[PDB]
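Action item from last meeting closed. Structure (154 res):
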């Protein structure tokens, strides 16, 4: 019982792009860009499509960096999130009614205003490590338990 999602982190040498979501699941929190994968669409093509829909940016080179499964207690479907990273993009981040993008210096990533799992695996993403994670949430703020291990192959 799992549903495919994407998450794209535009990660440059000294800064990362994040978006403040206006409404929906995760509203009020900085996050990477992504969403559901469509029928007949590859996960990577879905990640590319969502990056543009939400941030206005066109990615060229995308790299798999992680897989994180999210469980919310009481909700049947697990979120199977395929995480990607890129440095080579085109365009300028676009603010829309749905999303407010902002660049952050790497020592100023706003973990307090992000999903609480991010502080666990971001240190790996910033050091170019690949990972497999699982986070069991109660509600949207409480991590009941988790696993996170590095991998050589996502
Ligand atoms: N970046 C990010 N973390 C998350 N945790 C739970 C649900 C969705 C999430 N998106």
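Sequence:
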């Amino acid at each position: 019982a799992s549903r495919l999602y994407t998450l794209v982190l535009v990660l440059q040498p000294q800064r990362v792009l994040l978006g403040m979501k206006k409404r929906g699941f995760g509203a009020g929190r900085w996050n990477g860009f992504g969403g559901k994968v469509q029928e007949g669409e590859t996960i990577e093509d879905g990640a590319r499509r969502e990056l543009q829909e939400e941030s206005g940016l066109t990615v060229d080179a995308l790299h798999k960096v992680g897989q994180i499964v999210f469980e919310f207690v009481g909700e049947p479907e697990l979120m199977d999130v395929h995480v990607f990273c890129t440095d080579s993009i085109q365009g300028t981040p676009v603010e829309s009614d749905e999303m407010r993008p902002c660049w952050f210096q790497l020592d100023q990533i706003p973990f307090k205003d992000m999903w609480p799992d991010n502080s666990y695996w971001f240190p790996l993403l910033l050091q170019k490590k690949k990972f497999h994670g699982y986070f069991k949430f109660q509600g949207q703020d409480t991590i009941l338990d988790y696993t996170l291990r590095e991998v050589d192959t996502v």
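Note appended to the action item: Residues 8 and 84 are 5 Å apart (CA to CA).
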